[PDB]
């Protein structure tokens, strides 16, 4: 009862006001236990040495709040944990003399950032002086995880939303300059720094490919600007005075493995490797979302009118950075253009469903959509040949790999094209043509040729499926 009243006061201090449902839970409720899929684990907990924590859960459902030892999926909920301290069922001793309070009401990564970096790092002096002092090396290893994942929580807010790591370079302060343990934890820390730096610095298009399976010009543009900003923040981290002071102390200790490796193996703009200056050069860009149209306004006339201004904005070649516009990377950008094209083409084909026209309305939509799609394609082809006429001098010289999804899809549309064109042609002449035989055989011809042709047509429409990947087969 005293632990329960003190629990009332603690939840008042850390969550809000004591609720009436809480006051009802003061007396143990089997309904509460069945809702929380647990037995009297708190009662067993006060006596049991093994169980050391309990967590209060601030659930919120339909603008209402509710309040188990082991934490649950904590996304909408504020948590308060109370911890045993080696004293079990001691009435004379004060309950809060026997328990610890912590809060996890925040998101866990930023909150671990808070609790740890704010409390743990400055405390450790006298436990050390009393102990073998290698507990401080243990604490230096602890000064490697929370904030490491805390600015990586910006990464995760990106990650949870979506391949763009933002690092957290942790630093530890030494009590003595000449010390193998201290110089070594510093050295290893900066080596992990170099590894994490290399991770984002070596993000090439090949790594883009190993991770992603659906590319886009938008994706490339955003990832370039994201490289710009991520490397800017990493350069801020590295330019910070204490980050340089760790390397200065390692140089004083002559641990010249960390320092030249941090200065050369790293690919930072301050490092002689210049790749951050590459993003500096690539900053001078303009881009435009015209092709990427999801809604209906992206008609096929639209798509064509988009391909014309796009193959018009792309005429800027002679003035482009020859490296970032190198004929191979340019062919790659054309392939990404075509991938946006194919995305929008299938997007429009979705509602097309000319295969599902009624017998009287068959091939009408099939024609209309078909020919307009073919117009869009042929225009892509001719304007892109105008583009191929831009074959000129840049850094690189490369053959063309202009074999894109839109070509396979042109073939996916070719089988439907020949199909529905022959269907409409065939039915048009078939209704009017029956024979010079007599009319028993003429009506035989109607009910004999139309069903035959429609079976062939529907089987055709069915076996026109894998033409996405095997146009020959289909």
């Amino acid at each position: 009862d005293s632990p329960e009243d003190f629990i009332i006061n603690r939840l008042s201090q850390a969550l809000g006001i004591q609720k009436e449902k809480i006051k009802k839970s003061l007396e143990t409720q089997q309904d509460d236990k069945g809702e929380v899929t647990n037995k009297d684990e708190f009662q067993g907990f006060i006596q049991q040495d093994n169980s050391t924590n309990i967590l209060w859960v601030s659930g919120q459902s339909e603008k209402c709040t509710f309040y188990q030892l082991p934490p649950i999926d904590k996304f909408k909920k504020k948590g308060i944990a109370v911890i045993k301290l080696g004293l079990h069922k001691l009435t004379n001793e004060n309950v809060a003399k026997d328990v610890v309070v912590v809060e996890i009401t925040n998101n866990l990564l930023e909150h671990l950032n808070s609790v740890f970096n704010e409390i743990m790092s400055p405390v450790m002096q006298n436990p050390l002086n009393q102990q073998g002092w290698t507990d401080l090396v243990a604490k230096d290893l602890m000064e490697k995880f929370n904030n490491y994942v805390a600015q990586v929580y910006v990464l995760l807010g990106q990650i949870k939303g979506k391949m763009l790591p933002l690092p957290s370079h942790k630093l530890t302060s030494s009590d003595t300059t000449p010390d193998k343990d201290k110089a070594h934890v510093f050295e290893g820390s900066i080596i992990t720094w170099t590894k994490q730096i290399k991770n984002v610095l070596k993000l090439e298009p090949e790594q883009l490919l190993k991770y992603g399976n659906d590319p886009g010009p938008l994706a490339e543009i955003e990832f370039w600007q994201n490289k710009r900003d991520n490397l800017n923040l990493i350069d801020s981290q590295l330019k910070s005075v204490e980050v340089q002071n760790i390397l200065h102390f390692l140089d004083n200790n002559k641990s010249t493995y960390t320092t030249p490796f941090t200065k050369l193996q790293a690919e930072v703009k301050k490092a002689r490797l210049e790749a951050n200056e590459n993003y500096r050069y690539l900053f001078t860009l303009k881009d435009l979302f015209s092709k990427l149209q999801e809604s209906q306004p992206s008609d096929f006339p639209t798509l064509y009118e988009l391909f014309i201004p796009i193959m018009h904005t792309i005429l800027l070649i002679y003035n482009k950075s020859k490296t970032y516009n190198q004929p191979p990377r340019l062919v790659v950008l054309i392939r990404e253009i075509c991938n946006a094209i194919i995305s929008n083409a299938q997007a429009f084909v979705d509602k097309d469903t000319i295969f599902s026209l009624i017998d009287s309305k068959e091939t009408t939509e099939a024609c209309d959509k078909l020919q307009v799609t073919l117009d869009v394609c042929s225009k892509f082809k001719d304007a892109y040949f105008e583009y191929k006429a831009k074959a000129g001098g840049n850094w690189k010289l490369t053959s063309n790999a202009l074999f894109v999804r839109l070509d396979s899809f042109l073939e996916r549309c070719q089988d439907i094209l020949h199909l529905t064109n022959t269907i409409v042609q065939f039915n048009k002449l078939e209704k009017i043509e029956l024979g010079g035989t007599k009319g028993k055989t003429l009506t035989e011809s109607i009910a004999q040729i139309f069903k035959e042709f429609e079976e062939a047509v529907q089987a055709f429409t069915s076996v026109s499926y894998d033409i996405m990947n095997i146009a020959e087969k289909k």
């Binding site: 006061n9 008042s12 201090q13 850390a14 969550l15 809000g16 050391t52 924590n53 967590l55 082991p70 934490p71 649950i72 999926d73 904590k74 948590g79 944990a81 911890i83 045993k84 301290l85 080696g86 004060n94 809060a96 003399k97 610890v100 309070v101 912590v102 809060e103 996890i104 009401t105 925040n106 866990l108 909150h111 671990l112 808070s114 609790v115 740890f116 704010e118 409390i119 743990m120 400055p122 405390v123 450790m124 002096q125 006298n126 436990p127 009393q130 102990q131 073998g132 290698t134 507990d135 243990a138 290893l141 602890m142 995880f145 994942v149 990586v152 995760l156 990650i159 949870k160 790591p165």
Partner: protein, 488 residues
């Protein structure tokens, strides 16, 4: 003001009832400046108050407020600030504007983070982390997918283990016992230190320490008992010699040594520094860099056994930094035969679940996959033997002659016998289905042969000779009678 009232409400239930000294601590200007700078400052994220206690004719409680947090200083013994309670105040949001609006309307509960800890507890800091953060991270990595979730769990567990160890790490009562008077303190016998009885007691205790350390500094054969067991015992040697290193590095155990030096009783000072830890700690610290993972003994599928083999032979490439002796080339060959014995244990385990009862299909699959595993072993061990040829180029001083006459040769011949036996069984099944229009009567003879074959196959483990040889005396002659049928 609201914050002050709130912290006052929080204080009373924790340790003792609200007091005028508690209120005066707030009223004090320094604590007010710290609280204001905390509320309005992105930089300072914590507030601390010390419930300091002063012992006189009667117990006295005073409260102070500081930015610095020496929570374990008070737990350390023989200090002025001992037995002082600690309070923690953390802010949620760093920006001053958000702190302002939250103080004006938001709940102080959501807006402040509060942490309380015992006074005078050695493992309190280790207990807090384990109790809260180790649980939250474990639940959350499972609940939602994150980058490096498994590495994160591992890291949390490692820190928890270190923290748990270091509480009881302190030295007391292998177990090395100091004198009672010395555990009291060092220079408490001004002239009683120069005593035969006391000196001989410290002397015999240190002789016993020497014997206890030696009995463990003195390893097993690297050709027996299993590679996993060897790795476990190497790790045990690491942690064990490490714990004893800290034992000897404790102050008290070295001050009884300094007392033996002060009394000139060298016959224990020096055997402790000579006969005892350096070479073993050395050799063990060089063996540490082994990347063991018990994949083979927990594999149940040939694919798992295979991708285990790459894993082990890629972890093994750290042969170089390991120490000369524990990584002796002959001891490496012994660990190789032991790896192969674990491999053949797992091979028999997976074969148990049974090609001699089951139809030719599982036999085709298992035989193919086991041959692929054997080729993987052969080639990855040939790369490891490339590493074994790397060894002499820098260590031509000594050689370990090829001792390849192990059980693995005999049982790999046994597996060759199984391969040929069962593949010819395969081909004969179809060929007998082509030969004699009486499918059943011919396959009946063949299956009688296969059945008495598989029943006589109970002798492999002890007698590859008995099993395979007798199996052949029967199967070869009966399959050659079936070859006489194929000759019909």
């Amino acid at each position: 003001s609201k914050r002050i009232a709130w912290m006052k409400t929080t204080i009373c239930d924790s340790l003792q009832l609200k007091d005028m000294i508690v209120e005066e601590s707030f009223q004090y200007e320094k604590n007010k400046n710290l609280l204001e700078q905390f509320l309005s400052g992105e930089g300072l994220n914590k507030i601390f108050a010390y419930y300091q206690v002063q012992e006189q004719a009667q117990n006295d409680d005073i409260k102070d407020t500081g930015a610095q947090d020496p929570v374990l200083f008070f737990t350390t013994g023989d200090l002025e600030k001992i037995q002082d309670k600690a309070v923690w105040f953390l802010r949620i949001t760093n920006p001053a504007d958000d702190k302002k609006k939250a103080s004006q309307q938001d709940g102080n509960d959501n807006d402040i983070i509060f942490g309380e800890i015992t006074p005078n507890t050695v493992p309190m800091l280790n207990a807090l982390m384990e109790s809260v953060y180790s649980r939250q991270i474990d639940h959350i990595i499972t609940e939602k997918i994150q980058f490096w979730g498994v590495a994160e769990e591992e890291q949390v567990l490692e820190f928890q283990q270190h923290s748990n160890k270091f509480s009881s790490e302190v030295r007391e009562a292998n177990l090395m016992s100091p004198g009672t008077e010395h555990f009291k303190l060092d220079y408490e016998a001004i002239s009683g230190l120069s005593e035969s009885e006391k000196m001989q007691h410290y002397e015999m205790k240190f002789n016993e320490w020497i014997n206890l350390i030696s009995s463990q500094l003195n390893r097993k054969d690297e050709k027996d008992a299993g590679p996993a067991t060897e790795l476990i015992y190497w790790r045990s040697r690491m942690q064990k010699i490490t714990n004893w290193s800290e034992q000897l590095k404790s102050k008290d155990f070295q001050i009884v040594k300094a007392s033996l030096q002060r009394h000139k009783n060298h016959d224990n000072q020096r055997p402790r520094g000579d006969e005892s830890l350096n070479e073993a700690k050395d050799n063990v610290k060089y063996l540490t860099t082994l990347e063991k993972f018990i994949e083979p003994l927990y594999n149940g599928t040939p694919q798992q056994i295979i991708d285990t083999l790459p894993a082990l032979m890629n972890a093994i490439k750290m042969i170089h930094t390991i120490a000369r002796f524990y990584n002796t080339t002959d001891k490496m060959t012994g660990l190789f035969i032991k790896i192969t014995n674990q491999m053949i244990k797992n091979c028999k385990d997976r074969i148990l679940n049974m090609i001699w009862e089951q139809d030719p299909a599982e036999l085709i699959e298992v035989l193919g996959s086991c041959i692929k595993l054997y080729c993987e072993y052969k080639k990855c061990y040939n790369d490891t033997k490339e590493k074994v040829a790397d060894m002499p180029k820098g260590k031509t001083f000594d050689f370990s002659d090829a001792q390849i006459f192990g059980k693995f040769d005999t049982f790999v011949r046994r597996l060759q016998k199984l391969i040929e036996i069962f593949s010819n069984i395969q081909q004969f099944n179809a060929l007998a289905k082509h030969n004699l229009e009486g499918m059943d009567v011919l396959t009946n003879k063949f299956k009688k042969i296969i059945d008495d074959f598989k029943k006589k196959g109970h002798n492999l483990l002890d007698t590859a000779n008995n099993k395979f040889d007798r199996d052949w005396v029967e199967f070869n002659v009966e399959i050659s009678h079936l070859d006489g049928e194929l000759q019909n």
